[PDB]
Design an enzyme around this catalytic site. Structure first.
Site, mmCIF file in Angstrom:
data_model
loop_
_atom_site.group_PDB
_atom_site.id
_atom_site.type_symbol
_atom_site.label_atom_id
_atom_site.label_comp_id
_atom_site.label_asym_id
_atom_site.label_seq_id
_atom_site.Cartn_x
_atom_site.Cartn_y
_atom_site.Cartn_z
ATOM 1 N N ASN A 22 131.155 29.697 66.600
ATOM 2 C CA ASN A 22 131.033 29.921 68.027
ATOM 3 C C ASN A 22 132.418 30.136 68.649
ATOM 4 O O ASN A 22 133.364 29.407 68.343
ATOM 5 C CB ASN A 22 130.330 28.731 68.700
ATOM 6 N N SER A 27 133.938 30.263 72.633
ATOM 7 C CA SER A 27 133.560 29.978 74.019
ATOM 8 C C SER A 27 134.767 29.525 74.825
ATOM 9 O O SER A 27 135.715 28.970 74.302
ATOM 10 C CB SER A 27 132.456 28.935 74.085
ATOM 11 N N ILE A 28 134.675 29.725 76.129
ATOM 12 C CA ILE A 28 135.630 29.121 77.072
ATOM 13 C C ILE A 28 135.077 27.773 77.551
ATOM 14 O O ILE A 28 133.941 27.689 78.028
ATOM 15 C CB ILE A 28 135.921 30.006 78.283
ATOM 16 N N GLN A 78 126.090 23.288 76.089
ATOM 17 C CA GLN A 78 126.989 24.327 75.634
ATOM 18 C C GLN A 78 127.136 24.328 74.122
ATOM 19 O O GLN A 78 126.982 23.295 73.454
ATOM 20 C CB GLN A 78 128.341 24.121 76.326
ATOM 21 N N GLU A 94 129.685 34.859 67.832
ATOM 22 C CA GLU A 94 130.205 35.820 68.824
ATOM 23 C C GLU A 94 130.977 36.943 68.131
ATOM 24 O O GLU A 94 130.922 38.082 68.622
ATOM 25 C CB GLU A 94 131.104 35.179 69.880
ATOM 26 N N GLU A 131 137.314 23.322 90.446
ATOM 27 C CA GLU A 131 136.310 23.978 89.602
ATOM 28 C C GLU A 131 135.676 25.189 90.281
ATOM 29 O O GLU A 131 136.007 25.568 91.420
ATOM 30 C CB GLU A 131 135.334 22.935 89.058
HETATM 31 C C1 LIG Z 1 135.076 32.306 82.372
HETATM 32 C C2 LIG Z 1 135.129 30.798 82.346
HETATM 33 C C3 LIG Z 1 134.073 30.132 81.762
HETATM 34 C C4 LIG Z 1 134.012 28.743 81.823
HETATM 35 C C5 LIG Z 1 135.088 28.005 82.348
HETATM 36 C C6 LIG Z 1 136.207 28.686 82.887
HETATM 37 C C7 LIG Z 1 136.236 30.110 82.867
HETATM 38 C C8 LIG Z 1 137.412 30.933 83.366
HETATM 39 C C9 LIG Z 1 137.288 27.772 83.437
HETATM 40 C C10 LIG Z 1 138.379 28.351 84.357
HETATM 41 C C11 LIG Z 1 138.032 27.090 82.268
HETATM 42 C C12 LIG Z 1 136.576 26.713 84.291
HETATM 43 C C13 LIG Z 1 135.594 25.863 83.533
HETATM 44 C C14 LIG Z 1 134.432 25.370 84.313
HETATM 45 C C15 LIG Z 1 134.679 24.705 85.575
HETATM 46 O O1 LIG Z 1 134.069 25.124 86.565
HETATM 47 O O2 LIG Z 1 135.585 23.753 85.610
HETATM 48 C C16 LIG Z 1 133.389 25.298 83.471
HETATM 49 C C17 LIG Z 1 131.962 25.115 83.585
HETATM 50 C C18 LIG Z 1 131.261 26.276 83.846
HETATM 51 C C19 LIG Z 1 129.900 26.370 83.652
HETATM 52 C C20 LIG Z 1 129.233 25.241 83.236
HETATM 53 C C21 LIG Z 1 129.904 24.042 83.011
HETATM 54 C C22 LIG Z 1 131.298 23.990 83.149
HETATM 55 C C23 LIG Z 1 133.963 25.908 81.814
HETATM 56 C C24 LIG Z 1 134.204 24.610 81.200
HETATM 57 O O3 LIG Z 1 135.218 23.931 81.371
HETATM 58 N N1 LIG Z 1 133.167 24.119 80.424
HETATM 59 C C25 LIG Z 1 132.077 24.836 80.043
HETATM 60 O O4 LIG Z 1 131.236 24.286 79.285
HETATM 61 N N2 LIG Z 1 131.964 26.146 80.361
HETATM 62 C C26 LIG Z 1 132.928 26.696 81.114
HETATM 63 N N3 LIG Z 1 132.886 28.068 81.313
HETATM 64 C C27 LIG Z 1 131.600 28.760 81.018
HETATM 65 C C28 LIG Z 1 131.309 29.045 79.571
HETATM 66 O O5 LIG Z 1 132.358 29.839 78.987
HETATM 67 C C29 LIG Z 1 129.991 29.778 79.404
HETATM 68 O O6 LIG Z 1 128.944 28.904 79.865
HETATM 69 C C30 LIG Z 1 129.683 30.246 77.992
HETATM 70 O O7 LIG Z 1 128.331 30.726 77.936
HETATM 71 C C31 LIG Z 1 129.913 29.176 76.935
HETATM 72 O O8 LIG Z 1 129.757 29.771 75.613
HETATM 73 P P1 LIG Z 1 128.537 29.340 74.660
HETATM 74 O O9 LIG Z 1 128.957 29.940 73.319
HETATM 75 O O10 LIG Z 1 128.415 27.837 74.689
HETATM 76 O O11 LIG Z 1 127.322 30.036 75.214
HETATM 77 N N4 LIG Z 1 135.056 26.604 82.353
HETATM 78 O O1 LIG Z 2 127.198 16.986 81.524
HETATM 79 C C1 LIG Z 2 128.268 16.617 82.094
HETATM 80 O O2 LIG Z 2 128.751 15.439 82.066
HETATM 81 C C2 LIG Z 2 129.077 17.525 82.983
HETATM 82 C C3 LIG Z 2 129.718 18.270 83.625
HETATM 83 C C4 LIG Z 2 130.522 19.192 84.558
HETATM 84 C C5 LIG Z 2 130.257 20.452 84.732
HETATM 85 C C6 LIG Z 2 131.171 21.233 85.505
HETATM 86 C C7 LIG Z 2 132.508 20.782 86.073
HETATM 87 C C8 LIG Z 2 132.706 19.464 85.694
HETATM 88 C C9 LIG Z 2 131.767 18.716 84.919
HETATM 89 K K LIG Z 3 129.844 32.451 74.257
HETATM 90 MN MN LIG Z 4 127.765 30.839 71.710
#
Ligand SMILES: Cc1cc2c3c(c1C)C(C)(C)C[C@H]1C(C(=O)O)=C(c4ccccc4)[C@]4(C(=O)NC(=O)N=C4N2C[C@H](O)[C@H](O)[C@H](O)COP(=O)(O)O)N31
Ligand SMILES: O=C(O)C#Cc1ccccc1
Ligand SMILES: [K+]
Ligand SMILES: [Mn+2]
Ligand SMILES: Cc1cc2c3c(c1C)C(C)(C)C[C@H]1C(C(=O)O)=C(c4ccccc4)[C@]4(C(=O)NC(=O)N=C4N2C[C@H](O)[C@H](O)[C@H](O)COP(=O)(O)O)N31
Ligand SMILES: O=C(O)C#Cc1ccccc1
Ligand SMILES: [K+]
Ligand SMILES: [K+]
Ligand SMILES: [K+]
Ligand SMILES: [Mn+2]
Lengths: 500, 500
Positions: free
Chosen positions: A165, A167-168, A187, A230, A279
C-alpha cells in the site's frame, strides 16, 4: 523524465507554466514557509519553492509548498493536478477524476525493479542524521510538533507480501530517530498494521518517500480498493511500469526518483504524542495531544539538492480539499455505479469543506426503477456510508441531471431549494463517522459513529414523469434567438476573457 | 428632491454613479427587457433604463430594471440599496440593515398631505385606459400573464382607518381593467383583506403606486410589525415627513412623486387565474395556474415620461434576495434581541437562495445563560418560526462570534464543520411553511406547514468555558509580526485594489 513520473520534472513543469515562485533568500521553516504557503492557498497564487531554507545542511532540504492547490484563472484552475497526470493544464475536474478511475477496469501494470536511481545520490546512516536537526517545518503556530510529513507516501506491505500500500498520512518528528503519526481505521496503513500486530512477531517494515512521482502521490491520496497495490494501479493509469529501487535496510521498494526516503519500522507496540495539527477542515484544538503510532527511522537516502513537498493545510483551498475530497468523490461515483445506482457524477463541494458529496442522478434511469425518495436515499446511504470510500463524507446530496455537481453554487442552489429538511433526509447513526470533523471529534456525540445524512434534492416528479419546472434564469427562461440577440448587442448597448 | 425621497431623482443618482445604461432604441416588453435585466442581475452589471419601449403610448411607460440589485465591485456592492436610503454608496450590509431598523424605537413621523404632485401630471379614466394595451412586460417565457407589478407598493387600510399598510406583492394583468395577484397569509395585505371580508360590506379600497420614494419601497419589502403604518416608519427612518396626495377616486393617499398610480378595489369575493411566475427561489412550474386575488382598476394617474421599475426575478442576484432576505433577517435580529436572546447580527445567505438565516451569537452572554444546545435551539426556533418575520426562512444557523454572517463562505464553513446533522438540529413541523420554496409547494409534504429547522453551529465549549480552537488559516495560525512580514514582502518575493 516526464513530469507525472518524476517530481523534479514536475517542479520544472510548474516553472514552465509560470506557476512557480522561487524564493532564494533565507526563509524560516519555523512558520514562515508555511505562512507564505497558506497565503498562496487562500489566494490561489503560484506555488512557492523555498531554495534557501534556514537550517538546510548537506542537501536536506528545499521545500515546495502548495503542490496540488488551485490556480487563479478559471481556464487552468486545476492545472497543478493535471500536471500530476500528463493531462492538458485546461483539463476539467471530470477529466481528472476519469483519469484517476481509468485503471479500475484495467489489468495492473506491476512496477519494474531497477538497480539504482537519484534517490540513492546521498545517504545518512543511524549515526549521521538527527531529525531534530533538519529544517522540518512548524506549519501552524499551535501544532504539537514539526510535521515533516504532509505530502510524502508511506509504504507498507501485508505480512504475506501480496499487497503493498501507498498512502498519505501525516507524521511529525518525535525525537532524533522517530516520528509519530496518524494510523487510524479504516485506512489501509491501519489495516496492514493490524495484520502485523495480530502476527505479533515484529514491527512493520516501512518506508516514507517524499517527492515521489506525481501520478503516485495522487493514487496515494485516493481510496482505491482494499488489497490493491497502488503501484500497479498507477502503472495501468499512466500506461507505464513505475521504476522502483530497493531500500537499503529492508526489502521494500521506493520510486527511483524519490527526493527523500526514510527507511525504518512502524511499531506494533509503541505510541507517542501526536498532534494537535491544523487539519483539513480548517481547525486546530491547541493542546489536544492524543497518542499516535510511532515510527523508527534507521536510514535516510536523498537526491542531490533534495526538495520536500509540503501541504500547509487548513481553510480553503489546499491539497486536503482538491485531492482528498475529489478523489473520494471519484471512488464513490464508481462504487455507486457498481451497485447499480444511476449516478453519473460525484464531487465534494469545496463550500462544504469537502464534507458533502453531491451525486448527479440519471433521472431517466431513476424513473425506470419506479422507486421513492425514502427507498432510494436509504439504498444510496447504505452503499456509501458502509464503505471506506465514504469515510470522510458526512452528507450526500442527490441532484438531478440539470445540476453540474462540479459547480458548488449550483449544488447549493439545488440543496437549498429542492431538499425539505427532515422529510427529504435520512439520518445514519450506525455507520463509521470521521472524527476529524469538529462536530464529530470535538462535538456533542460519539466521535467515531454516526452524524451522517442523505439529503434528497431530487424533486418528486423526477421519480415519476420527469422534471416539471424551468429555471428562472437567463438560460432557461428566454428563447434561444432572444438570448443570442441580447448577447450580440450587449457591449453595443453599454454593458460589460476566458483565459484571463 | 433627494434620491431616497423621489424615484425620478434616484434614477439620476444611478446615472451620476455610473450605474445606469440608458437604452434609447426600441426594446420589446415581451421578454427582451426582462432578458436584458436578468443578464444584468446574474452578472452584477449596471441597471438598465429602457427609454424606448415597444408599445409605450401617451407617456406609459419607460422601464427601469434591477433597481435594488448588486454592483460588481466589492467596495460599493450594495450601493443601489444605499441610494434608497441616503447612505454612502460604500455602506455595509450591517449599516443598511441598521438604518432599516432604526425607526423601530422612534416615534413615527406621520405623512404630510399636499394638494398635488407630479403623479397628477396625467390621468386616464375608466373609458380611456386598457391594461392589455400598455407595454406590460412578459418577464419569463412561461409566466401565466404580463406582470405589471414587481416593484410597486400596494396601499390598503384597515376598515377602522387606524393602519395603512404599504407592501410589495406581485400582480399580473387579467383584462382591460383588472389584475390578479398574490394575497396570502400571513402577509399584511392578506390580514387587511380578511378584515374587510369579515365586515362583508364592500371591496377593499386600494391603490398601487409604482416608482415611489426609494425609502418607502424598502419599508414595503420589510416585515415591520403588525398594525404599524409604513409611512410613519419611513418618516422616522428618514427624519422627514413623507408628502402624500389623495387619490382621485378614493380616500387613500399616495406618494406625491409616484411615477404611476392605479386606483381601484381589491375584491372581497372574486378571484382569477394567477401565475405561474418565475419566483424568488429561481423556479417556474409552467402551467401551475392557481387562483389569486382580483383587483379592479378605475383610474390611472402618472408623471410625464413615467418610469415603471421592474424586478426580473429568479436565480441570483436580484431584489428578491437583496431586499426580501436581508430585510427579513434584520427584523429577525431585532425580534430575537427583544425576546432576550443573545443575537448580535443576522443575514440570509445568498448561497441559501435566502432560505436560511445565520444568527451570530454573543457567546459571552450565551455562557452566562448556562444552557444547552437542545434548549437554546428550541427557544430560538420557537421565537422566530412562530412569527411572521420568520415566514420565508426555513433554516436558522446559529454561529459564534468568530463568524461574519454577512460572508456566505464563512457561514457555509461553520455550518459544514460545526453542526452535526440530526443531533445538533431541531426540526419544526408545526409551524407555518413557505409554499414558494419548491420543496414545500411542489414537494413531498404539506405545502403550508413544517419543513423548518434550527441548525446549531455553536461548538460545545461555546456554551460553557469559551472557544477552544484556532482556525488553520493565515489570520489565526501565524503571529502578527510574521503575518505583516509576509504581506510586506509579498510582491518583492514575486506573488500577487480595493475600489476596482
Ligand atoms: C492529500 C492528503 C491526504 C491525507 C492527509 C493529508 C493530505 C495532503 C495531510 C496534509 C497530511 C493531512 C492529513 C489529514 C488531516 O486532515 O490532518 C488526514 C485525514 C484525512 C482524511 C481522513 C483522516 C485523516 C491524512 C492523515 O493524516 N491521515 C489519514 O489517514 N489520511 C490522510 N489523508 C487522506 C488519505 O491519503 C486518503 O484517505 C487515502 O485514501 C489513504 O490511502 P488508502 O491506501 O488507505 O486508501 N492527511
Ligand atoms: O480514529 C481516530 O482516532 C481518528 C482520527 C482523526 C482524523 C482526522 C484528524 C485527526 C484525527
Ligand atoms: K491510496
Ligand atoms: Mn490503498
Ligand atoms: C422585494 C420583493 C418583495 C416581494 C415580492 C417581490 C419583490 C421584488 C416580487 C418580484 C414581486 C416577487 C414576489 C414573490 C415571489 O417570489 O414571487 C413574493 C413572495 C415573497 C415572499 C413570500 C411570499 C411571496 C412577493 C409576492 O408576490 N407576495 C408576497 O406576499 N410578498 C412578496 N414580496 C415580499 C414582501 O414584500 C415582504 O414579505 C413584506 O414584508 C410584505 O410587507 P408586509 O407589510 O406584509 O410586512 N413578491
Ligand atoms: O397559497 C399560499 O399561501 C402561497 C403562496 C406562494 C406562491 C408563490 C410564490 C410564493 C408563495
Ligand atoms: K426532495
Ligand atoms: K412592509
Ligand atoms: K454544534
Ligand atoms: Mn406592513
Amino acid at each position: 523524465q516526464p513530469a507525472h513520473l518524476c517530481f523534479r520534472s514536475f517542479v520544472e513543469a510548474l516553472k514552465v507554466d509560470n506557476d512557480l515562485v522561487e524564493i532564494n533568500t533565507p526563509i524560516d521553516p519555523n512558520l514562515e514557509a508555511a505562512a507564505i504557503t497558506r497565503r498562496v492557498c487562500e489566494t490561489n497564487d503560484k506555488a512557492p519553492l523555498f531554495n534557501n531554507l534556514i537550517g538546510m545542511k548537506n542537501g536536506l532540504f528545499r521545500i515546495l509548498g502548495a503542490p496540488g492547490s488551485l490556480r487563479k484563472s478559471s481556464a487552468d484552475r486545476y492545472g497543478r493536478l493535471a500536471r500530476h497526470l500528463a493531462l492538458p493544464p485546461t483539463a476539467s475536474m471530470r477529466e481528472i477524476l476519469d483519469k484517476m478511475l481509468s485503471a479500475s477496469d484495467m489489468p495492473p501494470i506491476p512496477p519494474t525493479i531497477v538497480p539504482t536511481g537519484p534517490c540513492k545520490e546521498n545517504s545518512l546512516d543511524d549515526s549521521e542524521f538527527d531529525l531534530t536537526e533538519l529544517p522540518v517545518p512548524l506549519i501552524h503556530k499551535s501544532d504539537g510538533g514539526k510535521y515533516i510529513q504532509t505530502y510524502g507516501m508511506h509504504i507498507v506491505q501485508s505480512p504475506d507480501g501480496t499487497w503493498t500500500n501507498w498512502s498519505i498520512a501525516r507524521a511529525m518528528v518525535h525525537d532524533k530517530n522517530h516520528l509519530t503519526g496518524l494510523v487510524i481505521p479504516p485506512q489501509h496503513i491501519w489495516q496492514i498494521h493490524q495484520m502485523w500486530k495480530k502476527e505479533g512477531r515484529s514491527d512493520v517494515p516501512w518506508a516514507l518517500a517524499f517527492g515521489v512521482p506525481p501520478a503516485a502521490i495522487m493514487a496515494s491520496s485516493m481510496p482505491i480498493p482494499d488489497g490493491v497495490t497502488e503501484a500497479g494501479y498507477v502503472g495501468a493509469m499512466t500506461g507505464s511500469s513505475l521504476e522502483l529501487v530497493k531500500c537499503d535496510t529492508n526489502d521494500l521498494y521506493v520510486p527511483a526518483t524519490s527526493e527523500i526516503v526514510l527507511e525504518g519500522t512502524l511499531s506494533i507496540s509503541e505510541t507517542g504524542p501526536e498532534g494537535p495539527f491544523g487539519e483539513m477542515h480548517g481547525y486546530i484544538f491547541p493542546g489536544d495531544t492524543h497518542l499516535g503510532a510511532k515510527y523508527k527511522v534507521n536510514r535516510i537516502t536523498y537526491r542531490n539538492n533534495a526538495i520536500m513537498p509540503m501541504s500547509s493545510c487548513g481553510r480553503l483551498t489546499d491539497e486536503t480539499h482538491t485531492m482528498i475530497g475529489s478523489l473520494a468523490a471519484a471512488e464513490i461515483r464508481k462504487l455507486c455505479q457498481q451497485n447499480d445506482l444511476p449516478i453519473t457524477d460525484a464531487f465534494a463541494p469545496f463550500e462544504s469543506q469537502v464534507t458533502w458529496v453531491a451525486l448527479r442522478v440519471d433521472t431517466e434511469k431513476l424513473r425506470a426503477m419506479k422507486t421513492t425518495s425514502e427507498g432510494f436515499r436509504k439504498r444510496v446511504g447504505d452503499v456509501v456510508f458502509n464503505h471506506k470510500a465514504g469515510y470522510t463524507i458526512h452528507r450526500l446530496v442527490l441532484v438531478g441531471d440539470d445540476i453540474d455537481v462540479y459547480e458548488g453554487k449550483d449544488v447549493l442552489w439545488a440543496f437549498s431549494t429542492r431538499c425539505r429538511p427532515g422529510m427529504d433526509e435520512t439520518l445514519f447513526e450506525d455507520v463509521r463517522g470521521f472524527p476529524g470533523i469538529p462536530y464529530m471529534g470535538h462535538g456533542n456525540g460519539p466521535a467515531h459513529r454516526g452524524g451522517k445524512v442523505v439529503s434528497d434534492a431530487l424533486m418528486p416528479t423526477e421519480y415519476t414523469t420527469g422534471r416539471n419546472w424551468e429555471a428562472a434564469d437567463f438560460n432557461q427562461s428566454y428563447p434561444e434567438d432572444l438570448k443570442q440577440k441580447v448577447l450580440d448587442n450587449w457591449t453595443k448597448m453599454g454593458f460589460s476573457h476566458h483565459h484571463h
